[PDB]
Motif scaffolding. Structure first.
Motif, PDB file in Angstrom:
ATOM      1  N   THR A  43      12.327   0.811   6.122  1.00 56.99           N
ATOM      2  CA  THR A  43      12.027   0.161   7.485  1.00 56.99           C
ATOM      3  C   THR A  43      11.748  -1.299   7.405  1.00 56.99           C
ATOM      4  O   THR A  43      11.492  -1.670   6.077  1.00 56.99           O
ATOM      5  CB  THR A  43      10.786   0.910   8.090  1.00 56.99           C
ATOM      6  N   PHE A  44      11.722  -2.046   8.276  1.00 56.58           N
ATOM      7  CA  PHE A  44      11.537  -3.425   8.289  1.00 56.58           C
ATOM      8  C   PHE A  44      10.256  -3.822   7.843  1.00 56.58           C
ATOM      9  O   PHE A  44      10.260  -5.026   7.122  1.00 56.58           O
ATOM     10  CB  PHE A  44      11.930  -4.189   9.667  1.00 56.58           C
ATOM     11  N   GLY A  45       9.288  -2.986   7.957  1.00 52.63           N
ATOM     12  CA  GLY A  45       7.909  -3.435   7.494  1.00 52.63           C
ATOM     13  C   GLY A  45       7.724  -3.246   6.004  1.00 52.63           C
ATOM     14  O   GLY A  45       7.207  -4.465   5.406  1.00 52.63           O
ATOM     15  N   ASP A  46       8.800  -2.688   5.201  1.00 50.07           N
ATOM     16  CA  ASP A  46       8.592  -2.450   3.822  1.00 50.07           C
ATOM     17  C   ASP A  46       9.540  -3.569   3.209  1.00 50.07           C
ATOM     18  O   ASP A  46       8.868  -4.146   2.293  1.00 50.07           O
ATOM     19  CB  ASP A  46       9.174  -1.310   3.399  1.00 50.07           C
ATOM     20  N   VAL A  47      10.558  -4.042   4.038  1.00 47.20           N
ATOM     21  CA  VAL A  47      11.386  -5.091   3.578  1.00 47.20           C
ATOM     22  C   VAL A  47      10.685  -6.360   3.616  1.00 47.20           C
ATOM     23  O   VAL A  47      10.840  -7.254   3.136  1.00 47.20           O
ATOM     24  CB  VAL A  47      12.766  -5.002   4.284  1.00 47.20           C
ATOM     25  N   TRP A  48       9.856  -6.548   4.666  1.00 42.71           N
ATOM     26  CA  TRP A  48       8.855  -7.688   4.749  1.00 42.71           C
ATOM     27  C   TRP A  48       8.141  -7.937   3.664  1.00 42.71           C
ATOM     28  O   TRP A  48       7.903  -9.103   3.336  1.00 42.71           O
ATOM     29  CB  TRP A  48       8.130  -7.649   6.023  1.00 42.71           C
ATOM     30  N   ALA A  49       7.422  -6.888   3.189  1.00 34.95           N
ATOM     31  CA  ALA A  49       6.803  -7.208   1.931  1.00 34.95           C
ATOM     32  C   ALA A  49       7.430  -7.297   0.767  1.00 34.95           C
ATOM     33  O   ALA A  49       6.759  -7.896  -0.311  1.00 34.95           O
ATOM     34  CB  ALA A  49       5.554  -5.907   1.883  1.00 34.95           C
ATOM     35  N   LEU A  50       8.664  -6.738   0.713  1.00 38.69           N
ATOM     36  CA  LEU A  50       9.469  -7.099  -0.687  1.00 38.69           C
ATOM     37  C   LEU A  50       9.640  -8.155  -0.736  1.00 38.69           C
ATOM     38  O   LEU A  50       9.832  -8.932  -2.078  1.00 38.69           O
ATOM     39  CB  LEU A  50      10.788  -6.180  -0.476  1.00 38.69           C
ATOM     40  N   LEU A  51      10.176  -8.916   0.488  1.00 35.01           N
ATOM     41  CA  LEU A  51      10.316 -10.412   0.254  1.00 35.01           C
ATOM     42  C   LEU A  51       9.161 -11.417  -0.008  1.00 35.01           C
ATOM     43  O   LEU A  51       9.051 -12.285  -0.573  1.00 35.01           O
ATOM     44  CB  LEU A  51      11.170 -10.909   1.480  1.00 35.01           C
ATOM     45  N   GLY A  54       7.359  -9.722  -3.392  1.00 35.75           N
ATOM     46  CA  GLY A  54       8.036  -9.453  -4.610  1.00 35.75           C
ATOM     47  C   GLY A  54       8.272  -7.907  -4.961  1.00 35.75           C
ATOM     48  O   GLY A  54       8.652  -7.686  -5.995  1.00 35.75           O
ATOM     49  N   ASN A  55       7.434  -6.976  -4.127  1.00 38.86           N
ATOM     50  CA  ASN A  55       7.369  -5.806  -4.417  1.00 38.86           C
ATOM     51  C   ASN A  55       6.828  -4.843  -3.472  1.00 38.86           C
ATOM     52  O   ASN A  55       6.443  -5.514  -2.344  1.00 38.86           O
ATOM     53  CB  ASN A  55       6.640  -5.375  -5.523  1.00 38.86           C
ATOM     54  N   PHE A  56       7.028  -3.654  -3.556  1.00 36.64           N
ATOM     55  CA  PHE A  56       6.547  -2.688  -2.467  1.00 36.64           C
ATOM     56  C   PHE A  56       5.104  -2.297  -2.356  1.00 36.64           C
ATOM     57  O   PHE A  56       4.255  -2.528  -3.545  1.00 36.64           O
ATOM     58  CB  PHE A  56       7.195  -1.467  -2.350  1.00 36.64           C
ATOM     59  N   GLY A  57       4.474  -1.619  -1.333  1.00 38.52           N
ATOM     60  CA  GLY A  57       3.086  -1.328  -1.386  1.00 38.52           C
ATOM     61  C   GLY A  57       2.193  -1.441  -0.185  1.00 38.52           C
ATOM     62  O   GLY A  57       1.786  -0.765   0.490  1.00 38.52           O
ATOM     63  N   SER A  58       2.391  -2.768   0.127  1.00 37.55           N
ATOM     64  CA  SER A  58       1.483  -3.181   1.214  1.00 37.55           C
ATOM     65  C   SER A  58       2.248  -3.094   2.567  1.00 37.55           C
ATOM     66  O   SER A  58       3.641  -3.474   2.640  1.00 37.55           O
ATOM     67  CB  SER A  58       1.095  -4.524   1.235  1.00 37.55           C
ATOM     68  N   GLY A  59       1.783  -3.238   3.663  1.00 39.48           N
ATOM     69  CA  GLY A  59       2.539  -3.076   4.863  1.00 39.48           C
ATOM     70  C   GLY A  59       2.356  -4.114   6.066  1.00 39.48           C
ATOM     71  O   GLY A  59       2.378  -5.390   5.405  1.00 39.48           O
ATOM     72  N   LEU A  60       1.853  -3.824   7.133  1.00 36.42           N
ATOM     73  CA  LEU A  60       1.528  -4.994   8.013  1.00 36.42           C
ATOM     74  C   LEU A  60       0.423  -4.736   8.900  1.00 36.42           C
ATOM     75  O   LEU A  60       0.088  -3.193   9.253  1.00 36.42           O
ATOM     76  CB  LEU A  60       2.786  -5.378   8.954  1.00 36.42           C
TER      77      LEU A  60
ATOM     78  N   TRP B 364       7.777   1.676  -5.128  1.00 41.92           N
ATOM     79  CA  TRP B 364       8.668   2.673  -4.365  1.00 41.92           C
ATOM     80  C   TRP B 364       7.887   4.001  -4.342  1.00 41.92           C
ATOM     81  O   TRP B 364       8.433   4.837  -3.331  1.00 41.92           O
ATOM     82  CB  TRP B 364       9.814   3.031  -5.055  1.00 41.92           C
ATOM     83  N   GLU B 365       6.727   4.416  -4.743  1.00 42.52           N
ATOM     84  CA  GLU B 365       5.960   5.581  -4.692  1.00 42.52           C
ATOM     85  C   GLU B 365       5.505   5.529  -3.295  1.00 42.52           C
ATOM     86  O   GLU B 365       5.178   6.646  -2.760  1.00 42.52           O
ATOM     87  CB  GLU B 365       5.039   5.518  -5.605  1.00 42.52           C
ATOM     88  N   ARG B 366       5.175   4.321  -2.624  1.00 44.53           N
ATOM     89  CA  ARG B 366       4.342   4.245  -1.143  1.00 44.53           C
ATOM     90  C   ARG B 366       5.450   3.832  -0.259  1.00 44.53           C
ATOM     91  O   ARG B 366       5.156   3.323   0.773  1.00 44.53           O
ATOM     92  CB  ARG B 366       3.447   3.275  -1.341  1.00 44.53           C
ATOM     93  N   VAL B 367       6.771   4.246  -0.116  1.00 41.19           N
ATOM     94  CA  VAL B 367       7.910   4.079   0.747  1.00 41.19           C
ATOM     95  C   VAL B 367       7.933   5.184   1.484  1.00 41.19           C
ATOM     96  O   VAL B 367       8.468   6.562   0.934  1.00 41.19           O
ATOM     97  CB  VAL B 367       9.080   3.530   0.115  1.00 41.19           C
TER      98      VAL B 367
END
Lengths: 367, 370
Positions: A43-51, A54-60, B364-367
């Motif tokens: 989802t766009f929310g995860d790609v927002w945090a990846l940019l 620099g990694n996944f985990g946090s949302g919005l 990626w664990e929290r996606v």
């Protein structure tokens, strides 16, 4: 010299956010290909945090009441007015006076606000309100956006915006991203850099924006023949929407992503859009066999957005919402760079002269 | 694709060629379209005409009259309020993109917003419960500067109008800073002038933009109470806090704008002048003593505080006065960029991580996949 104004080709920054590999024909966000991102349904929310991180985990953060009940018929201008009120009302501080943790929150909080303005503006004034608990219990920001606007949106339409928003989240250093970096290099608050990036985007020559291909797509559905109307527009002096000089080495990766998403979700106008693409490509490559001509991503962006019940005049606001990810990414990177962006200029104007030598000096009132 | 002795921030990189103004730093002089600012101030050229000198390249035209605000929104931040008003100019006042208008329309639209920002600053300094200054006594004024002080103070001291004219003309335009650069980039895309003017105000508000008048009022208040001027600055540097209004050299020898403003303070008989110069002699002689190798000169923002305070401008209204004056530089650079008609679009170099899979990313664990 032989210099080019506008810093064409001049390297201004060093980025770790994304690489638009035009030679290789792929777009990678922090190394991750966007074709991989849309295919695994991120989802766009995860790609927002990846940019941004620099990694996944946090949302919005969740949606909150508007800072200013503004409504003028121009949603682009409404977001800019609300962005101004963030410092007095929400207490946004300058970038120089906050840590990287606070700057990240305000960027996400401002990103959520810009999307709340756009979603509410699309829902009719006299329509029944969507309850706040239905909004707050949505899985993703894309779902929250669509539910706040449509009330009970089609799941296929939610996937279409998720495909479009991550394919437009970031695309290098254009005028809007450059503006946000220059303003942030001054130390101003994040709302000032975001408001400046939006102003640069409103310019017609900025860049990407869903093409005005619907009046042509409608014409092909009525007449039936696509080759004739495509030949007609080029013969009557008008330009062809959504087709021009190449951007990447060949086909834009974002162009095939949005066409494959249109076919995968079952867009009703997919077959006509493909018929238009074939007629346009065959005709443009036939008249200029020297030019490299590829289909614009803005062509299939309009097809996908229109499939999700997005009107034509709201489509430019759809692009602004997705680009918040790239803007917030480069704003935080500029904050950690900590270098003011000031170029110089060379003077070619008139030499030293007296005030009486200037034209029209006889009309000046003094003392 | 590689860095080559690369410095970030475009420092020293030439971006445009301009005919508007030239800050001759090696010569120690500033010229607007060739005319020295010392001539413009000493011969009492009002700010409205210097505005027309910078935007049009000649004299003759003026500025439109004032009008009601487009938006009755006032949050207490005049900077934010002006940006919100600049926004409303597209739907309420009909501002078209630069790509769809000629030089004549764009010139007005710049001048109309310029007067709009001045009136925002003007009657934001007047109490609403004070008697509304008559509408005709404003019309009986002549210069744009005079109408400003009339809307605010009602009965402005003629000496104070000259002081504002001295300040605004000195700070009307000073080359290629961030706010001017930002205004050109936005204008290079083809947007309306109100968006380009709003982008410059945002970059103007940043602390590192510089040029804002110095907060030297408490120091000058302390010097007058306990008259020594030297022990006052000597103690401040001994304790380790910043000496306001003094620092690196802007021009190679003396900032011409500082010379103009200091002379304008004495010519108009500013009561703080005698105390101000003694603080200048003491701070310069002290800073050069503690650093016999660094070039240290008086900042123009030190005398800008002296002049503006003499005009009854509070300490935190002085930044808005800077934004008001710089409208000439912003508009002239906007119009010149319109005629240039080329987009500003630099490039960047990627040095980040190579190609990888979404599963090899931290988190990626929290996606949750759609």
């Amino acid at each position: 010299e032989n210099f080019v104004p506008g810093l064409d080709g001049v390297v201004a920054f060093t980025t770790e956010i994304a690489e638009p590999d035009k030679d290789g024909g792929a777009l990678r966000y922090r190394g991750v290909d966007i074709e991989d991102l849309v295919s695994q349904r991120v989802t766009f929310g995860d790609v927002w945090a990846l940019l941004v991180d620099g990694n996944f985990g946090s949302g919005l953060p969740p949606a909150e009441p508007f800072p200013l009940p503004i409504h003028s018929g121009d949603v682009r201008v409404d977001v800019q007015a609300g962005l101004a009120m963030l410092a007095p009302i929400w207490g946004y501080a300058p970038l120089l006076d906050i840590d990287d943790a606070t700057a990240r929150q305000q960027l996400a909080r401002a990103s959520v606000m810009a999307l709340s303005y756009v979603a509410q503006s699309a829902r009719g004034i006299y329509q029944p309100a969507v309850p706040q608990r239905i909004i707050d219990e949505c899985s993703t920001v894309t779902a929250r956006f669509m539910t706040m606007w449509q009330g009970e949106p089609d799941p296929r339409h939610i996937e279409a915006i998720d495909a479009y928003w991550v394919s437009a989240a970031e695309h290098g250093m254009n005028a809007s991203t450059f503006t946000a970096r220059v303003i942030a290099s001054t130390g101003a608050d994040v709302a000032a850099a975001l408001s400046g990036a939006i102003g640069a985007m409103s310019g017609p020559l900025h860049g990407g924006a869903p093409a005005r291909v619907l009046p042509m797509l409608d014409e092909v559905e009525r007449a039936g023949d696509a080759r004739s109307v495509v030949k007609g527009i080029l013969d009557r002096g008008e330009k062809l929407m959504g087709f021009g000089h190449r951007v990447y080495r060949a086909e834009d990766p974002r162009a095939r992503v949005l066409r494959a998403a249109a076919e995968r979700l079952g867009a009703p106008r997919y077959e006509v859009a493909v018929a238009v693409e074939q007629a346009a490509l065959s005709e443009l490559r036939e008249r200029r066999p020297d030019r490299a001509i590829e289909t614009n991503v803005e062509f299939w962006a309009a097809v996908v957005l229109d499939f999700a019940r997005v009107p034509a005049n709201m489509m430019p606001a759809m692009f602004t919402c997705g680009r918040t990810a790239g803007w917030c990414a480069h704003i935080l990177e500029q904050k950690r760079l900590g270098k003011l962006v000031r170029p110089s200029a060379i003077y070619v104007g008139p030499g030293p002269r007296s005030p009486e030598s200037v034209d029209g000096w006889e009309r000046v009132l003094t003392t």
